[PDB]
Each structure stands twice: as C-alpha cells, then as structure tokens.
Design a protein around this ligand. Structure first.
Ligand SMILES: CN1CCC[C@@H]1CCn1cc(C2=C(c3c[nH]c4ccccc34)C(=O)NC2=O)c2ccccc21
Length: 281
C-alpha cells in the first residue's frame, strides 16, 4: 500500500462543515495536487461520549463500498489527538442545497435523481447494510452532477448495533418510533419522503417541533399538493406505508425489481445511470 499519510502531507483550507463529533475540512495533497474532504475527529471527545462503535462503523462500512453513488474513503491516519478520514470532495454540495436553490424539480429531474437513489440503495441493501439517516443533506452532488451518498457512522450492518440511533426527525420511519428496530424498510421510507420533497419542495411531515412531527408520522398525516406528478404520487403512496413489510423494495414485496419497474420509472435505463448525462436546470 502507499505510506500512511500525515497531516504535514496536506495543505488544509476551508472548513466545509462542523458537527458535534467531527469537522470536514478541504485539504490539498502537496505531492499530487489532489483535493480531498478530510473528516477530522477528536479522539478524546469520541471516547468521552462513547462513540467508538460509530467511528469504527463509518470507516468499516465506507471501506466495504465500491460504487460511484457513494463517497469514497481513500485513506485514514491519525496523530496523538485526532483521526483523519480522506473522503471524496463532492464539488456541487448537498442535494438539500439544490432543492432550496431551484425549488421543486420538474418530472425529468425528479426521475433521474430518484433513479440514482434507488440504484444506490439497491447496491447498499445488497451488501446487507442500512443507512438509517438518508436525507438530502447526506446525498452529495459531484462535479458531474451525479449523486454521492455519505454519512455512514450511523449505518447498520445486518445479521445472518440493533436499534440505538434515530435519524433526522422528518425522515424517521414509523417503526423506529413504535419498535426499537431499524430495517431496510426504514431507508425505503426515507426514500419516499425524499421523492415527495423533490416534487413538492418540502418534506411530507412538518411541524413546529420533533414531538409533533413524530405524531404526524405514526398517524400517516400528510398530503399531496395538487399538481404532484401522478405516477410519482403513486410511488410515494407505495413507500410511505405504515406496514413496513408492505413497502415497495422490501423482501416481502419481492425486492428491487418491482420498485424499479414502477410506471414512474418507465423511461429509465437502470443499467448505466452513472454513464448518463443528468438533466440540467
Ligand atoms: C455532515 N454535515 C451536515 C451538514 C453538512 C455536512 C453534510 C453531510 N456530509 C457531507 C460530507 C462530505 C462532503 C461535504 C461537502 N460539503 C460539505 C459541507 C459540510 C460538511 C461536509 C461536506 C464532501 O465533500 N465529502 C463528504 O463526505 C460528509 C462526510 C461525512 C459525514 C457527513 C458528511
């Protein structure tokens, strides 16, 4: 392998963003000119807050992925105080940004981006991995305007780490609120919310606070605005179903075939999405 990288191998630049346990900073590797988004984690804080399982899962899960719709973990290293993860730098930011910028998507853009998310989830669930925090904030856009999903510390790798995390309120599935249990279904729920959000401009469950959002979720209290692309409404209704075993994409619903075969995706070529030019605003 290459020599372990070190802080002194890079010129660190702008902070991209800041979380409770990490900071992502853009970094230029002196020896190659390459730019990376390096996620930097203070070891003390991770230890104090019992987060080693999560930091260990993020590295381990990202290390196992090898597909263009995910952020790549290129390297890791550490000094006495911090850990460093060398990630892809997605130049065009998060999908959330793009949703806020251009407002709601026309059907062509909705379809294209929905198809890349479905195709990514198919890859992920095939490896027996659940994301658990799928939302537009963590679906990045690369330079060529294809998706790159990130944020895997909170993921779950399935059996043959059970039910401790709950993602962003607006995307939380009913089964997380009623059971102590994450399943592939929960990602498919979040997918339904994301499709609704691309079309509508806002997510389907909204209120003043998290308690009120959760009450709406368990009662399935949401509505479609009037011009909502009909086949997309049909797809969303087949995902935002309280019975987790009855969501399109689930093993009990015969898998990703039926989901990919929905009318909404009739014009999609599923075989080489990453090779296709994305529609442009
Ligand atoms: C986690 N943050 C919440 C708000 C901004 C950021 C978005 C989620 N996110 C982007 C990440 C990444 C990138 C970011 C790209 N723009 C960002 C802005 C703030 C924070 C991170 C990024 C990137 O270029 N490559 C990434 O993996 C990222 C990496 C690990 C865990 C979460 C990550």
């Amino acid at each position: 392998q290459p020599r372990k990288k070190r802080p002194e191998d890079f010129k660190f630049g702008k902070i991209l963003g800041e979380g409770s346990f990490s900071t992502v900073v853009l970094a230029r590797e002196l020896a190659t000119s390459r730019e990376y988004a390096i996620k930097i984690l203070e070891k003390r804080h991770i230890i104090k807050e019992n987060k080693v399982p999560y930091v260990t899962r993020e590295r381990d899960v990202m290390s196992r992925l090898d597909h263009p719709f995910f952020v790549k973990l290129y390297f890791t290293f550490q000094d006495d105080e911090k850990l460093y993860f060398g990630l892809s730098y997605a130049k065009n930011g998060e999908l959330l940004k793009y949703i806020r910028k251009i407002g709601s998507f026309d059907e062509t853009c909705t379809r294209f981006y929905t198809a890349e998310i479905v195709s990514a989830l198919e890859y992920l669930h095939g490896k027996g991995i659940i994301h658990r925090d799928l939302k537009p904030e963590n679906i990045l856009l690369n330079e060529d305007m294809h998706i790159q999903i990130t944020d895997f510390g909170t993921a779950k790798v399935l059996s043959p780490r059970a039910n401790s995390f709950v993602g962003t309120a607006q995307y939380v599935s009913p089964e997380l609120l009623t059971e102590k249990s994450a399943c592939k279904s929960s990602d498919l729920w979040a997918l339904g919310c994301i499709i609704y959000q691309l079309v509508a401009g806002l997510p389907p469950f909204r209120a003043g606070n998290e308690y009120l959002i959760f009450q709406k979720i368990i009662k399935l209290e949401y509505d479609f605005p009037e011009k909502f692309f009909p086949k997309a409404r049909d797809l969303v209704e087949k995902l935002l179903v309280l019975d987790a075993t009855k969501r399109l994409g689930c093993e009990e619903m015969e898998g990703y075939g039926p989901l990919k075969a929905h009318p909404f995706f009739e014009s999609v070529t599923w075989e080489n999405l990453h090779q296709q030019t994305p529609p442009k605003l």
